[PDB]
Amino acid sequence: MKRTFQPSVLKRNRSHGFRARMATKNGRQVLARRRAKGRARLTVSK
Amino acid sequence: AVVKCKPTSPGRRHVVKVVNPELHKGKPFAPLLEKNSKSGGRNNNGRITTRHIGGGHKQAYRIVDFKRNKDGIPAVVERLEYDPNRSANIALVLYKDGERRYILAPKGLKAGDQIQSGVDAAIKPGNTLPMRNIPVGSTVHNVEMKPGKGGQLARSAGTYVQIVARDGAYVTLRLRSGEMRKVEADCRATLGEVGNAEHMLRVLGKAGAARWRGVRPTVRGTAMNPVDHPHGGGEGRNFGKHPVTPWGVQTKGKKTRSNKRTDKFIVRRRS
RNA sequence: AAUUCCUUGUCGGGUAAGUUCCGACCUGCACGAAUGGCGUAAUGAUGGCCAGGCUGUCUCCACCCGAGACUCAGUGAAAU
RNA sequence: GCUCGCCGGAAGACCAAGGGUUCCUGUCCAACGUUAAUCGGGGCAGGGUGAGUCGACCCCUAAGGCGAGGCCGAAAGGCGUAGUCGAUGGGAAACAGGUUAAUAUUCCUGUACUUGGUGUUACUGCGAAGGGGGGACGGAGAAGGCUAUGUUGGCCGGGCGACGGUUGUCCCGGUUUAAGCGUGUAGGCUGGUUUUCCAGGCAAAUCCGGAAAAUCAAGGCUGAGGCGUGAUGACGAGGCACUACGGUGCUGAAGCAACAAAUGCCCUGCUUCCAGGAAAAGCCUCUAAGCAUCAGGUAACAUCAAAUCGUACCCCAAACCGACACAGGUGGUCAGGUAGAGAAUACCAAGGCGCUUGAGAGAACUCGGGUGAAGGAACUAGGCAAAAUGGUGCCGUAACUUCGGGAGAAGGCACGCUGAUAUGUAGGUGAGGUCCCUCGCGGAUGGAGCUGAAAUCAGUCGAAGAUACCAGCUGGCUGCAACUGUUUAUUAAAAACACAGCACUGUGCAAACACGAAAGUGGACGUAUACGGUGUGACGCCUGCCCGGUGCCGGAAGGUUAAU
RNA sequence: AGGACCGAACCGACUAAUGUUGAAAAAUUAGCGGAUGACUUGUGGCUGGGGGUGAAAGGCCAAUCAAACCGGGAGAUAGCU
């Protein structure tokens, strides 16, 4: 059957990317949480 | 021309169609078309507000001339054309100075006939002139409401507004719903009943015939479950309510006119 | 009767034999007129009954062809 | 390596999305492969992706996002104007041959084209954010011209057959060539031209639009294909040197015609229909301030420049989504032969694979199949499952019917092959020759060849001729729903939902109604023949009596009735 | 001509058998319905949790739906085990 994660890098970036995180306030809060936790992959890009 | 379709298929059994052979068999006047795309009933918020809107056929918006503020310049009528943005066919008029325009086609106005706006116009169908001048009893259409705002009333297919009494600076004219209403006397109006008076005789015949116009299915309220509609579920065909809209408010009788700053113009409400 | 409890109502058809089906009757527990009544050609992977043809569905199973089961060599689980 | 089998509208080939080295060579078999492994998409090492034309980047926009000022909002923020982004759309240009272990429309060879910059020569009114044209657009159908492609013949090279025959009305293979440049055809649209005048294109216009004359009637635009050139090249069965045996350098014949023919091109066409079928730029044109020897424009010539990013490889799959080397999912393009209506089906070509455990045996019992004596639903909740019908032609066809249907109703007869009619008929195509000729891609006659049903008469073989695959079971009575449709992804596909039609009801436009604290948006760039809500549900005969109750509407003499 | 008829691609899911520590957390095999339309599909976009969308099944909203997932109040409360 057809599963649920049918990938596309265009949609991936334009949905959860960095240029789309820092657009709203909650995005920069997400990045703040991650920079504080120490996560090495801040976003989904690359 | 109402044509009963031979009952070959079960979807063509009940189709009664209107074939006006004098419309234009071709393309429209391109410099008066403009991009008109759809919504589905979803405003800038994104959420559906008007229900039962969506899909259908694509259409282009014909800029139709409702003010008709070109006074003094006579105009021939080049052709009659379908308009899908509307219910009444549109005429393509050509003035003397070359300018072509789109007007609503009044009853019995064929190609090659002179129309003319202006306070000096002769009394006949087509002529747009203020209601100061048109006599009492004259069947007009495309009435304005504020001087200089454009036609707003008697715009549908075959509907006409009658002038019955001018008093002072106002005219009390009888709308299509039998309502009486006073508009001030500078508001322009065209003469005649709008054309295509048998937009009401046709039968769509099938369900696709209506979905072609972006008319989605209209689910009965009494089918849905009690959370989705006040009319709610219930084993068997159960109603026991008092009829309401999907939002609680009464229907089948309750009045909803609640605008006062325009009531001083209404004389006698509808039937 | 997608409505009827007594009920396998009573009568006729169809069956050697019919609680289901078809047609009348009318004592409608507890039908009924747009939460529509009655009738309705065509349509339906729709519910019920019947008939022709056909057959291992069956009286009643028999043989045969392949995949496993079985024996050998290699790898090698699971619930409890 | 020689056989055998399987797919062949795929299980072949090229991509897009996705992956990211899985690509190619050497080396290793500890771990991964459901076993072994010398093998591998595994480990280690090295190597490999070449662009002015292909695709991104770039110019332009759709739905849509962000959106300076702005309006709204306790703060955060919401909407939105100018703008600025956003392809899944519009915009300039390359083909054939060869080569590598792995790249090639990128490298090499031969032949091309496009867009700009600068400089010379000649002619010269050039210039927007503005106007106009154009780009610019639907469904369905019909056949006219063709091509791709295929078949047959001719021509060339080779063969004379392990077993009867095979010097021929025999067998096998080849018979390929583009972009570009030139010609301008089948077909499609279209009147042209010169002048005068103007309430329009925000202003101006020499352009579009409108009007009035003359004026000729054939001009113009578009356009598949063919033919010439590209090409005395390239490619070509080969034979033929050994040179490190892998093929390396060499020469290299024929390289034509008829017929059939697309779902591809003319065609963004033509006809018809109602449901009325994107936007902006690139491109041409007209002028505005501005500059008018200059600038700038046009044409030829000369040179320069075209940057940067991707290119390996899989791509219906062992490399993407499924925890797996998973019987599942995934969009586009190419589409050979014989039977065939066919992209079904069966056998095959190019090509690709035999599904990463085998070997024996031939028990019960389970899975997938074949056949069956006599009977033929007796089984059973129920003809569930299986059997049976299955094609084309001619005849024939019931009650009922909304006059369409029902209807492929039901039911009968024929079917192979050979010969004759007809050494191949009707029909399609149409050469050579003649005649015209406005001399070419012209027309008329003529019929050469090539292709070629269907039918009748006769004969002959089998138990059987729609011989395999493929391919309706049929008839009567009835309930519900008119019908086509949608629905519980993953136990319910229905009598449920929808529906066209009917009624009530609200709604006079800053409409009701809805999302919003609001701005505002949808309704709608719509106007009562319109829009929202509610019930019923095609069609026909109709829809009875009750306003006590609870609602809705209208009245309001009187009584009770809050803040103040 | 047509929400026409037979039928492949394409879209679905009526019956039966197998499977049910499956090849598969919904499939296979033999039949099956629509197949010029209220059809289907690729790419991008919009609607967000008492909310969406809903030809209406309380269905669908990342194998979760009579109120999603994640973090927090939180070591909620449990006269129960």
Side-chain angles (χ1 to χ4, degrees):
Chain A
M1 272 309 318
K2 162 187 201 174
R3 281 320 174 268
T4 73
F5 179 69
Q6 307 291 312
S8 313
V9 175
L10 187 47
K11 306 188 91 163
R12 185 194 70 156
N13 281 327
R14 223 185 292 189
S15 316
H16 331 296
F18 175 95
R19 271 284 312 178
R21 286 306 186 197
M22 293 204 84
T24 56
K25 195 159 213 308
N26 321 115
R28 323 204 298 277
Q29 289 196 217
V30 161
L31 315 173
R33 293 201 282 261
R34 285 172 159 261
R35 291 183 179 116
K37 178 152 196 176
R39 207 160 277 255
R41 200 167 322 114
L42 267 290
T43 56
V44 66
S45 41
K46 278 190 182 290
Chain B
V2 285
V3 191
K4 292 202 177 194
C5 283
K6 290 287 169 106
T8 44
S9 283
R12 294 283 272 178
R13 190 175 265 285
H14 289 302
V15 183
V16 171
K17 54 179 179 284
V18 172
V19 292
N20 208 11
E22 311 191 319
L23 268 67
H24 197 38
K25 293 186 181 300
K27 311 304 168 182
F29 186 70
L32 298 164
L33 281 84
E34 205 272 294
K35 182 209 166 54
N36 166 42
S37 89
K38 292 173 173 59
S39 84
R42 296 159 164 73
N43 55 330
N44 81 75
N45 274 317
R47 309 208 196 176
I48 192 169
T49 62
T50 321
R51 284 177 328 174
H52 319 164
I53 301 185
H57 205 304
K58 165 167 56 183
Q59 301 153 358
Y61 172 60
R62 324 280 206 285
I63 288 150
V64 181
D65 192 75
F66 286 131
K67 287 178 190 159
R68 305 202 51 197
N69 52 348
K70 207 176 179 80
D71 271 29
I73 308 164
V76 198
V77 169
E78 264 183 277
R79 47 176 151 262
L80 311 182
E81 319 178 348
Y82 202 67
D83 184 18
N85 286 281
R86 198 151 282 97
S87 179
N89 316 316
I90 51 175
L92 168 73
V93 311
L94 165 58
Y95 290 100
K96 299 300 165 192
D97 46 341
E99 217 189 357
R100 304 190 159 78
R101 278 183 172 203
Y102 269 145
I103 74 151
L104 274 151
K107 182 185 135 181
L109 183 80
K110 58 176 183 286
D113 275 353
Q114 316 275 318
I115 79 175
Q116 182 204 3
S117 178
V119 310
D120 70 299
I123 285 295
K124 81 195 173 301
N127 299 320
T128 284
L129 71 170
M131 279 168 320
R132 279 179 314 228
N133 304 318
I134 327 178
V136 159
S138 81
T139 316
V140 286
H141 85 75
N142 199 56
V143 197
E144 291 204 357
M145 275 176 39
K146 280 186 168 186
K149 207 187 178 198
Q152 277 165 239
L153 291 67
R155 264 170 47 166
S156 170
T159 77
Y160 56 91
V161 169
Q162 177 167 11
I163 297 194
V164 294
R166 168 150 62 244
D167 288 358
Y170 278 30
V171 195
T172 319
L173 41 82
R174 161 151 322 183
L175 300 190
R176 196 46 191 143
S177 50
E179 166 164 355
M180 304 288 294
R181 160 168 196 86
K182 287 152 163 294
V183 286
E184 57 166 329
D186 293 32
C187 313
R188 305 258 162 119
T190 308
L191 282 155
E193 327 170 7
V194 197
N196 198 45
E198 50 190 4
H199 164 59
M200 71 169 312
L201 278 303
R202 65 174 140 219
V203 173
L204 301 188
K206 49 176 185 163
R211 284 282 294 286
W212 291 342
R213 303 158 163 80
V215 171
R216 298 207 50 203
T218 305
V219 163
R220 268 172 318 132
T222 195
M224 300 177 253
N225 280 293
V227 54
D228 301 354
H229 190 307
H231 280 191
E235 266 69 18
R237 295 192 181 118
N238 258 327
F239 197 68
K241 313 283 174 171
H242 268 100
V244 296
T245 73
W247 297 286
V249 182
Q250 178 68 245
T251 176
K252 269 188 214 296
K254 182 173 159 80
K255 287 191 169 33
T256 59
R257 167 146 171 103
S258 176
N259 172 284
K260 277 162 200 180
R261 69 103 196 159
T262 78
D263 188 300
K264 47 175 147 306
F265 308 115
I266 288 175
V267 197
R268 214 205 57 216
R269 287 288 329 182
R270 86 169 152 285
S271 158

